[PDB]
């Protein structure tokens, strides 16, 4: 409003500049240019040594259409510059940078943002002190302000505590030089999805909303693909203006020059979405981006009308990691009390002994028991408060999931706490016991750091005990906090005091009620504010069970009167339902002071508990059943030996509780109350129970019946088969698993030896359905009429009845549990219930970055993880079924249960290194000749290979139709950049090729988990591995499109990519458009699959398991089709 920059943000989208760093690399500067060898590479020193070079880059961006340029001052901080011996030059280099930008900006009417980066040292991990970090930002911001920047920009924030430190430092520099400007703060979200130190986007925005920041936003780390979700969050929720400056995606080496593939036109489309859909206010580029990126962005967003920002932000608190709302719906905001020195005894002794692992474990307990935040008080009689805090707080900063309520009478101790604790904190003591000047101290501290304040109702003349007092004190404090200090009502939590009403004393017994009555009046009079109570103090001086109940009831009553938070022992808080009826009634009589003549509620409440008052306390029979159903590994072997000592025979133990459990699991799975991963968890408990009882039995029985299970010849790792093995074995039966790639010779060899009820055949691949026919054709000659059970994703239910002519007894199995039902009926444990348009010419031939084939190693797995089809993973692979559930209810199920597994598996795979993404990829000059695609050499021009792609029957569609014919007249420049010899030979098109692999490691790891009987982790690890390999193919296809110059036609939503929402298509050998696997040997010769550790078999199958190749087609009308 006041400042021109914020006026401009209201009127139009402001286009920021792109990268300074990458633009300097083009100029090929020398140590002389940086003013010495020591200073070489420091861009900020160029403000001194070569201003004209910095000026020129600003001009290039201004001309392109940036209305805002950033000063070349990112690392103009003491501790950053120290690496170059320039620690003393921060204010100078900041100033000169700001003066260079000012000179470039003034003719163009453009804004200048005083950019300061996050530095090289993280405050939250104690790599730099608050005071040191504070000084560096204050120094460099005075320089920026003196050079005439129109805003201060805190860029690339990794540490949310640095954001608070830098905001305060910068605001004080403004005070010193007597000039305010708007403050823009931009965080950086890693591809993992949080800031580097751990802060998610909810925590980051909660922190920023409490501080005096005019524009919040995002830059660097990722391209716009991964930013989308984060920038959507900021745009939708932030009351401030929103900025967004993505990278040009992941970098790529190209002859020792670092190259980025995100084009101007793609960036433009992303920023158009961010401005037009989400209402982002400023947009620019970060690493990789140049003037051309800015040019296209400006063109895209010019003219668009800004959306107005939300008026309000929900009141919420934040730790280093996560946000928590102060208003908890229905419930309360529970603050754990047990990290108090005076209160808790266990904490007190742990603090004195310096038992960190004890204190953190205690803090975990409170969180598990349902604390939303934790109270912290270390103020003991004698001890140095500051010194105990200095020891403890660095560990709490990074250890704690939940935020902290700093409970201290000392403002010095509070200020110290605020310098260690990241996020948005609460402060406990804001009261007028020692006059205004110590109340105002804590308030200004809460306002400056953006903390939520607990406003305790204690004035100069003693405490507030009655209703009238509690009200009058609270209104005086509310007036002070709002009008003087400027704190919002939502920031305040008023503690109307909570006095003890027990101990047998009168005067104490009507005070719990005057709190409740005052709470009502202030709820109505002061809307917006919160209400906290030290709830455990009402029952101070009472037996353990008695205090538990009275506390629970006073909590509930306070809630009804308007309580929004409470300091409690969350573990002990009872729902009033579970309090017995007499106790509840007496607790209320006590609270509200309902003395009849022959009745004291304190006596009767006390008297009640005198002479009154896990699944381990169950029957031994039923406990072993629920061990299976609930999937409880711990205490199985302990309970089994207890059963054996009571003379329970192993067979009737297995057939009794344990098979009863797996039956209940089969029923719950049918009813959709239990999903597949948890069913496998039950099967583990069963397999552990069998394995314990195997040495303690003489039976060695055949079970319900035998089954010879196997996977067909020329197939691959069939998890589906192994799930049959798991489910059947642990439902009583005896499977013999023959493995994969078994021919019909050795499968029937098992049949004569074992002599089974049924013979299971299975196959993942589509081509092994015809190999199953050949198996059944082989069997009828020898005269076999055993009931064969066919299954797999390859087969269909109609096809087994059509195959029933060849073999009489053949049955389908959709999943493992149909295969179970089948085996029940055969063995006799159940009744027999089962007894094309033509292709127009391409508008261009897109120019690739190179011809030939390259290798790309070490692609960021978090970037790849973005392109996972989570629907395919969670529903398909992991078996979180959709049927009998809504589409928003299923999204809740997976975000609860599946998504944490994924996050864990991603973190594991990155740390432990068991996904190794490699990519073999390239472009070849090609041409159609008839019904063939000729692949010409980039060097010689000779025809290296020829592909006869199948055409659809009845003169239909073919892959060759997407390619230009030999000797065609060029559509444009092709002669200038096609390989000279190939072009003379008649090549007139380009074909992309790609082979991606995650390596052999995830296959080994999956097999080892199945071999160890960790069935659930086998399911998870296998599924994750498949879809991460598909994600790498999806990701790389996007990279191929980007470097080809066609990715501006991609969808800006990821699920649209999975529905081919992009130009062209990729095609793998096996797909119905090209089902001949033999062509993969042609692609091996062109590319050289050994270069990324991929091998092609005799049967033209790729090894290892997690590997896929594809032809990549640029043609806009290219779509998936079938012959
Ligand atoms: K920039």
Numbering used by the authors: 37 to 649, 658 to 879, 897 to 1184
From the paper:
Cobalamin-dependent methionine synthase (MS) is a key enzyme in methionine and folate one-carbon metabolism. MS is a large multi-domain protein capable of binding and activating three substrates: homocysteine, folate, and S-adenosylmethionine for methylation. Achieving three chemically distinct methylations necessitates significant domain rearrangements to facilitate substrate access to the cobalamin cofactor at the right time. Here, we use a thermophilic MS homolog (tMS) as a functional MS model.
To that end, we crystallized full-length 132 kDa tMS in its apo-form and solved the structure to 2.78 Å resolution. tMS adopts a compact, wreath-like form, and each domain aligns well with previously determined structures of equivalent excised domain or tridomain constructs. The original apo-full-length structure reveals the global orientation of each domain, resembling the reactivation conformation (Act-On) and displaying the flexibility associated with the linker regions that connect each module. The active site of the helmet-shaped Act domain is positioned above the Cob domain, where the cofactor would sit, similar to the position of these domains as previously determined with the structure of the C-terminal MS fragment, that includes the Cap, Cob, and Act domains, trapped in the reactivation conformation. Notably, tMS crystallized in the apo-form; despite the absence of Cbl, the Cob domain retains the same Rossmann-fold demonstrated by the superposition of apo-tMS Cob domain with the Cbl-bound Cob domain of E. coli MS structures that have so far been determined. The four helical bundle Cap domain is displaced ~25 Å from the resting Cap-on state and virtually identical in form and position to previously captured Cap-off structures. As such, cofactor entry is not occluded and its binding site is solvent accessible, with the Cob domain found to be preformed and ready to bind Cbl requiring minimal rearrangements. The tandem TIM-barrel Hcy and Fol domains are poised adjacently, separate from the Cob:Act domains and align well with previous structures of either the excised Fol domain or with the N-terminal fragment consisting of the Hcy and Fol domains. The edge of the Hcy domain rests against the distal side of the Act domain, forming extensive interdomain contacts through >25 hydrogen bonds and salt bridges resulting in a buried surface area of ~900 Å. Two out of four linker regions, Lys649-Asp657 (Linker II, Fol:Cap) and Glu877-Ala897 (Linker IV, Cob:Act) could not be modeled due to a lack of sufficient electron density, though the other linker regions, Pro342-Asn352 (Linker I, Hcy:Fol) and Met741-Gly747 (Linker III, Cap:Cob), could be modeled. As the only structure obtained for any B12-dependent methionine synthase in its apo-form, this structure gives a unique insight into the potential domain movements required prior to and once cobalamin is loaded.
